[PDB]
Design a protein around this ligand. Structure first.
Ligand code: JO4
Length: 115
């Protein structure tokens, strides 16, 4: 239940990304985690996702909203290195090159506020 980086060593995280490059070359390896202090939104069922590289960040927002089963009254923000993604209709492939972690994953955090 701890964050991903506390459950896998840096070496193991790098290895995982390299494996994903071999097995699913057209996908972006993503870690999506609930903000540390979040109180309203539920937890996702899982944290690691393989995203086809053509998916827009703004579509990813709508997909995650559906996966959390949110009403249209529930606020939801998806942040990548503190940047909100709701209006970024750019493919994740381009965000990946810019925002990837040193371990090769693309990390995101979701919250009910955009701080
Ligand atoms: O358009 C697709 O086919 C596709 C496939 C996988 C995706 O990854 C997810 C799925 C749910 C939540 C977070 C990431 C997103 C889109």
């Amino acid at each position: 239940d701890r964050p991903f980086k506390q459950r896998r060593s840096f070496a193991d995280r790098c290895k995982e990304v390299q494996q994903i490059r071999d097995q699913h070359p057209s996908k972006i390896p993503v870690i999506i985690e609930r903000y540390k202090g979040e109180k309203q939104l539920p937890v996702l069922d899982k944290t690691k996702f393989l995203v086809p590289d053509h998916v827009n960040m703004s579509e990813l927002v709508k997909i995650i909203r559906r996966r959390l089963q949110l009403n249209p009254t529930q606020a939801f923000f998806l942040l990548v290195n503190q940047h909100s993604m709701v209006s970024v209709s750019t493919p994740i492939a381009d965000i990946y090159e810019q925002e990837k972690d040193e371990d090769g994953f693309l990390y995101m955090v979701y919250a009910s506020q955009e701080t």
